[PDB]
Amino acid sequence: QKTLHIYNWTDYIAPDTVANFEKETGIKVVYDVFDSNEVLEGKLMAGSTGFDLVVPSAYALERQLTAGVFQPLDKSKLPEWKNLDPELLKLVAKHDPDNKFAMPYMWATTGIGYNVDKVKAVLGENAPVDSWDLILKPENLEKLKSCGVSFLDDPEEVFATVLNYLGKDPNSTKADDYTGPATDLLLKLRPNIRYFHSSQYINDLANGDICVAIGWAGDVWQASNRAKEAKNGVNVSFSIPKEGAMAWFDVFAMPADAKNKDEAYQFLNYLLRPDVVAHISDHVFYANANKAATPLVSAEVRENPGIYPPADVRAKLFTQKVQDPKIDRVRTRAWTKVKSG
Ligand SMILES: COCCOC[C@@H](C)OC[C@@H](C)OC[C@@H](C)N
Ligand SMILES: [Cl-]
C-alpha cells in the first residue's frame, strides 16, 4: 500500500476529488492545505516537505526552480498533457521554460470581494465597486472600517496592487516606490483594516462579518455561493477593477525528493481528465487550465465574467515579477512596518 501526499491551497478542490481518486486507483491520499505561497516556498527551501505534489503559483515556481527543489515532469507518463491550454502553457512557460516542471492547474485574478448591500448602504448606490477606490482610497476605507475590511496576508499582492493604483509599475524595481508612496498609502489605510488574512475572509464575507476584502476571485465566488446555500440573505460579489488587476496561475509541481513519483503521476493524469477538473471548477469557482474541460464546466462558472473574464478584462491584467534581493528586502521591510501600524 502506497500513500500520496499532496500540499494544495485551501478551498481549492472538490469535496470528492480525492475520494474519487482513491476509489479508482487504490492509492491512499494524505491531503494538507496552506493559504500562502511564502508558507509553501518556506518548506520547499528549508528541507524535505514529504509531499509528492505541491501547488505553487507560477511566478513562485520560478524562484523555487533556481534552488532545484523540483524534478522534471516525465511527459511520457502524462499522456493527456495535450488537454492543457497552449496559451496558458505559454504564459506559464515564462516562469517554467518549455513547461518542464509544472502542470497548470487553475488561474484567476486578485480583486475586490464585497458585500453588495452593505457597501451600497454605507457608500450609497454609486459606490465605486468598479474601482480599487472602494478599498484603497482612505476616505472610503474610513467609512467602511466598522463593517469590516480585510487585506490578503501577501506582501507581493498588496504592494503590486498599491503601486498599480498609484500609477506606478505594479512590478516596480525602484525601492523609493515601496518605502515612499506605497508605504504612505498603506499607513493611511492601515487603521481601517481589520486584519491581514488570505483565507478567513471567505467565511467572513459569506456571513456578513466583513464588507470589503482583497480576495482571490474564486475565493469570493465561493463566499457568495456559501451565503446563498445558507439562505442568509447576504449578497457577495467580486470586482476585477477598471484600473487592472493581478492575474496568476497555480501549477502542480513534483518536489525533487518526492517519495511516490509514480502515484504522483497518476494524480496528475487524473487532474488532466476533462470531467475531473471541470468538476473542480464547478465547486471552487475557479477557471481551470484545461482547454478540453471548458465545455464541461457549469454555465454558472463558465459564463461568470469574474471567473472566465472576457478579452476586454484580460487586457487590463498584469502578472507578478520575481523581484531581485534588493527590492525583495525593501518590500518585505515596508510590509512588516505596515502590518504593525
Ligand atoms: C475516511 O477516509 C477513508 C478513505 O477511504 C478511501 C476510499 C474512498 O476507498 C479507496 C481506498 C481503498 O484507497 C485508499 C485506502 C488505502 N484508504
Ligand atoms: Cl503566477
Numbering used by the authors: 29 to 369
What wording appears in the published article?
To gain insight into the evolution and designability of ligand binding and specificity, we analyzed the homologous PBPs, PotF and PotD, which are Escherichia coli putrescine (PUT)-binding protein and spermidine (SPD)-binding protein, respectively. They constitute the first elements of two separate multicomponent uptake systems (PotFGHI and PotABCD) to transport the cationic polyamines PUT and SPD across the cellular membrane. Still, the protein-binding modes differ: PotF shows affinity for PUT and SPD, whereas PotD exclusively binds SPD. Prior to this work, we grafted the seven differences in amino acids from PotD binding pocket onto PotF; this resulted in PotF_SPD, which will be referred to as PotF/D throughout this work to keep naming for mutants more concise.
